[PDB]
Design a protein around this ligand. Structure first.
Ligand SMILES: O[C@@H]1[C@@H](O)[C@H](O[C@@H]2CO[C@@H](O[C@@H]3CO[C@@H](O[C@@H]4CO[C@@H](O[C@@H]5CO[C@@H](O)[C@H](O)[C@H]5O)[C@H](O)[C@H]4O)[C@H](O)[C@H]3O)[C@H](O)[C@H]2O)OC[C@H]1O
Ligand code: NA
Length: 153
């Protein structure tokens, strides 16, 4: 089959802010990575080390969303972007509030597919993560992230 990358859930993560609200970092636990969903654009990220062949790759995240997050009606966006060339990215993935629940774990997926093949490249690390969108509250826990490339292993 294809190349499968299993992301380390005990090292290498950071809080992230892509909007007008500052983040409060991340917290590691036996269950994975958790962040406080303080506002629109607040999330959690890690880096895929260069070089990358990420076009047509599938990102799958197992997550748990808190009751307060579900009540806030905010959405969840898996995204990826070129580190230090931030506007160049994959911005078309979204899980809306209506499809989330606080009652069980969920698997959210995102396919990277850019018309200019920006994600097949050697120059930059790629920042990948998940962020809240809208007017959020509560917390988000990431248990695992698995990336399946469009390349034979
Ligand atoms: O359909 C089209 C859509 O594709 C389009 O979506 C918009 C795409 O652009 C999005 O905005 C980007 C969000 O992410 C930002 O990156 C931030 C930059 O800041 C970084 O944090 C810095 C890290 O470095 C430190 O030194 C510094 O202290 C920190 O501030 C952070 O890690 C990145 O995530 C990009 O800069 C933005 O361009 C936008 O939200 C989408 O709506 O919309 C148009 C539509 O036609
Ligand atoms: Na929950």
């Amino acid at each position: 089959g294809n190349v499968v990358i299993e992301v380390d859930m005990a090292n290498g993560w950071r809080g992230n802010a892509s909007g007008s609200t500052s983040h409060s970092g991340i917290t590691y636990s036996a269950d994975g990575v958790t962040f406080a969903a303080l506002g629109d654009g607040v999330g959690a990220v890690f880096d895929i080390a260069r070089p990358t062949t990420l076009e047509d790759a599938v990102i799958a995240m197992v997550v748990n969303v808190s009751a307060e997050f579900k009540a806030s009606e905010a959405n969840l966006q898996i995204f990826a972007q070129l580190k230090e060339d931030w506007s160049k990215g994959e911005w078309d993935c979204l899980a809306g509030s209506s499809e989330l629940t606080a009652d069980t774990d969920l698997t959210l997926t995102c396919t990277i597919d850019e018309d200019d093949d920006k994600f097949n490249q050697t120059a930059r690390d790629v920042q990948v993560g998940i962020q809240a969108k809208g007017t959020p509250a509560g917390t988000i826990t990431i248990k695992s992230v698995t990336i399946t490339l469009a390349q034979e292993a």
